[PDB]
Write a protein that binds this ligand. Sequence first.
Ligand code: K1A
Length: 171
Amino acid sequence: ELRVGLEESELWLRFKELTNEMIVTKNGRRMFPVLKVNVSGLDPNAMYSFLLDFVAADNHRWKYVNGEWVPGGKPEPQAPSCVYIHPDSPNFGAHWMKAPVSFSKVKLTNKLNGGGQIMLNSLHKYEPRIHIVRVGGPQRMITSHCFPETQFIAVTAYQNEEITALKIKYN
Ligand SMILES: Cc1nn(Cc2c(C)noc2C)c(=O)s1
C-alpha cells in the first residue's frame, strides 16, 4: 500500500486555524508554506511523475468582512485548475522516496499565462491535491491525494494581518 504524508503539518495547521491565504499575481507568486510530501511504498526502480493541482473547495466567492471570511450567495461552477508537473518528473521511485517532494517552484497567478504558472480565481477557496503517475511501465497507474490542512483562499493581497504575521515569522 503506497503511503502519502504532509511534511510540516504542525505549521500548515497554524495557518489553517486562521484561514490560510496565498497571493496570486499576473506573473505568478510562489507558495509559503511550500507543499512538501513524504512518500513511501513506491517501486524504487519504477518511473513516476508528481503532479499538483488545486481543487475549488466550493463554488463561492469569499470576502473578508469585519475581520472574518464569509462566502457569497452567487455560486458558479468552478472550471478545474491546470496541473503543475514537479520539475524532477519523470523520475525513479527511489528519487521521490529519498527526501520530501517539495513543490517550491509552482507559481500561483490570477492571469492566463505562457505556461508553468497555475491560474486560480482570486477570493476562491482551494484544496491542494497531488497525482502520482506511474509512467513508462506496462500498466499506467495514478494515486491521488488531497491535503485539507493546506486549504487556502487565493488573494491579490493579505486580508488577515494574523496570516501576514505567520508568513513572515516562519519564512
Ligand atoms: C484589518 C487589519 N488590516 N491590517 C493591515 C495589514 C498589515 C499591516 N499586514 O497585513 C494586513 C492585512 C491590520 O494590521 S488589522
